[PDB]
Design a protein around this ligand. Structure first.
Ligand SMILES: [Cl-]
Length: 583
């Protein structure tokens, strides 16, 4: 087992700048609470060590696994036990249990202050004083709040963040240039985080096979002229990439992803002409381009899908003798014909087809039994379409704020045991599905909506698993990955839930609220709306509206009032009595 130093290999493969970023991210994701300055020191020591091994491969520590290098540096942190003590224990284990112990402490919602944005002048000045430390902080802040963030994409966002600052910090008015572009970039980055968290849940909680079937369908939609063997190749390498990334093997992840990008670029002629635009760019823009590439057009001359999958004499034979191959070919062939379906719908159709063959190939005239199996998809196709049609109409009608309020009331009634901040967060994110998708054309609307519901509901499943209270969430989350959305949509109001009393100290506000922007005021209003519903589950909209209306007017009234405490002191008690009279 004489071998090439792994740390040298990786540093040589990704280059010093990406190496440093990737090591910072690894530490930030393993030790989410530790201050930036500790992480920086650790990054410095690992980088120095990588650079010594690059120079002499037989140097101290050069023959160790990456896991061992990281773990040894973490365990030589003098101020280790004070931040967790959970982790302190980890350091008495040997590899591999030690690495596994660090990964089990990744926290999906760490108890941290919310990410502050400084004022434009402040932000700009920090950028100009020290670029490297400034972008350090950004990787760290994002990585510690999103411990499964796709590491190479985080590097790419840090580039985009750098370009927005380079743009705006010279321009005349700074804030007005910055705020919309940084809000725009945060939005995209929270979507990236949610997509990747679902890749990791699928891999880690449901197996390599759940992720592979998902990637097959999505890549067949995106590169429908490519052939099955090529798609499957790409699925296999991407699975290895996300497995490593989701597991904190981030250097390996970035290196394997670059190789994948190079492979698709070299084979672009047999994959998609739309690759031309990506394949001349530098690696982070190159990979990000591939990652989100617009679907190719559907190729001409594809025979009716029913010839292979219903009419061929060998349908039962191919299903029985080569099941995964045959069903993978189904998913490919059906998906490449349907870029207008969502991935989860296509996976559901695949499961129905498989259940039909299981049943029918076990009878004495199977073709008799399964002849209509493609026509019988229609009910599974219409349900998602009606969901989209009816909720987009509801969105158009109510607008963003009241669409969020509708979903908050609806979700609090389905799963009222769920903690308030999870409810508020999840419902606001479902609201944001409307805004993103509802003005899209039909061709792309079902995919947009249902696969974005997928990532939002996974966030619910992940937050809930950390703090488990609702049996119904546990059931929808653990039973089926591809059935989650219909399972959640089918839940009615929970009529066995016992209403909680109203906490006196729920409308008690110290006028620290008056320093909040309007966007965070809405969140306080929506938090209060959830607690109203948890107290009177059958409360009407007009009732909820008059109480939140009366909280709106309290805020409108006191925050412009010189001496907001004397106001809030005298207006807040009268709100918790006026609420009882309405409810
Ligand atoms: Cl990718």
């Amino acid at each position: 087992e004489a071998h090439k130093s792994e740390i040298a290999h990786r540093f040589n493969d990704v280059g010093e700048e990406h190496f440093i970023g990737l090591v910072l991210i690894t530490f930030s994701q393993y030790l989410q609470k530790c201050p930036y300055e500790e992480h920086a020191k650790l990054v410095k020591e690992v980088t120095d060590l990588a650079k010594a091994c690059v120079a002499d491969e037989s140097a101290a520590n050069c023959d160790k696994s990456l896991h061992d290098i990281f773990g040894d540096k973490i365990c030589a942190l003098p101020s280790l036990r004070d931040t967790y003590g959970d982790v302190a224990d980890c350091c008495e284990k040997k590899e591999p249990e030690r690495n596994e112990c660090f990964l089990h402490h990744k926290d999906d919602k760490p108890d941290l202050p919310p990410f502050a944005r400084p004022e434009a002048d402040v932000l700009c000045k920090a950028f100009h004083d020290d670029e490297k430390a400034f972008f350090g902080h950004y990787l760290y802040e994002v990585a510690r709040r999103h411990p499964y963030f796709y590491a190479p994409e985080l590097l790419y966002y840090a580039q985009k963040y750098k370009a927005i600052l380079t743009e705006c910090c010279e321009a005349a008015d700074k804030g007005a240039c910055l705020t919309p572009k940084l809000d725009a970039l945060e939005g995209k980055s929270l979507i990236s985080a949610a997509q990747e968290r679902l890749r990791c849940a699928s891999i880690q909680k449901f197996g390599d096979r759940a992720y592979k079937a998902w990637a097959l369908v999505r890549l067949s939609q995106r590169f429908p002229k490519a052939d099955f063997t090529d798609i499957s190749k790409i699925v296999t390498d991407l699975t290895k990439v996300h497995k490593e990334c989701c597991h904190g093997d981030l250097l390996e992840c970035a290196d394997d992803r670059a190789d994948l990008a190079k492979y698709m670029c070299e084979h672009q002629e047999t994959i998609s002409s739309h690759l031309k635009e990506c394949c001349d760019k530098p690696i982070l823009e190159k990979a990000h381009c591939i990652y989100g590439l617009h679907n190719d057009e559907t190729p001409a001359g594809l025979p009716a899908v029913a010839e292979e999958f219903v009419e061929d004499k060998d349908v039962c034979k191919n299903y029985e003798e080569a099941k995964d191959l045959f069903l993978g070919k189904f998913l490919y062939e059906y998906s490449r014909r349907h870029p207008d379906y969502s991935v989860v719908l296509l996976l559901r159709l695949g499961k129905a087809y498989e259940a039909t063959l299981k049943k029918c190939c076990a009878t004495d005239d199977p073709h008799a039994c399964y002849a209509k199996v493609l026509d019988e998809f229609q009910p599974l196709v219409d349900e998602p379409k009606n969901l989209v049609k009816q909720n987009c109409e509801l969105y158009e009608q109510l607008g963003d704020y009241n669409f969020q309020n509708a979903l908050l009331v609806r979700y609090t009634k389905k799963v009222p045991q769920v903690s308030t901040p999870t409810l508020v967060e999840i419902s606001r994110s479902l609201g944001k599905v409307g805004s993103k998708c509802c003005k899209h054309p039909e061709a792309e609307r079902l995919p947009c909506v249902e696969d974005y519901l997928s990532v939002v509901l996974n966030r619910l499943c992940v937050l809930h698993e950390k703090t488990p209270v609702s049996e119904k969430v546990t059931k929808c989350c653990s039973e089926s990955l591809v059935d989650r959305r219909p399972c959640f949509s089918a839940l009615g109001p929970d009529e066995t839930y016992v209403p909680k009393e109203f906490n006196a100290e729920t409308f008690t506000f110290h006028a620290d609220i008056c320093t909040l922007p309007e966007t965070e005021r809405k969140i306080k209003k929506q938090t209060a709306l959830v607690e109203l519903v948890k107290h009177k589950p059958h409360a009407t909209n007009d009732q909820l509206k008059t109480v939140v209306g009366e909280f709106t007017a309290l805020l409108d009234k006191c925050c412009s009032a010189e001496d907001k405490e004397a106001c809030f002191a005298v207006e807040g008690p009268k709100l918790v009595e006026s609420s009882k009279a309405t409810l």
